[PDB]
Amino acid sequence: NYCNQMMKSRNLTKDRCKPVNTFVHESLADVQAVCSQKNVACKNGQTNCYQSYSTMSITDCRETGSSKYPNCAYKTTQANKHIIVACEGNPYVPVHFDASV
């Protein structure tokens, strides 16, 4: 499935099994534009987070209960949700995924 492939392909599960990860199916510039959208606070309290005005296409990758290195196993859940990212640097671009509503 998509998650098993993309997670290994992107060097996420080549040396370990990551329990969960999210992929955004939007253009790079459209996702970077989120850094100047709705400011909100991050889970950790810091307020350099921003929520997208609109929902975006995303795939949630989740490890099953039987997954175990070196044979990671994921469940694929596709959805459209608002993404929350933390930004920093100059240009002000995303550096962390904080959640999706």
Binding site: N11, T22, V24, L28, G89, V95, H96, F97
Partner: peptide, 15 residues
């Protein structure tokens, strides 16, 4: 080697 903006992209972006 890899900056944090690059890592976010490789880990979460699939355009």
């Amino acid at each position: 080697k890899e900056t944090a903006a690059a890592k976010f992209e490789r880990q979460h972006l699939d355009s």
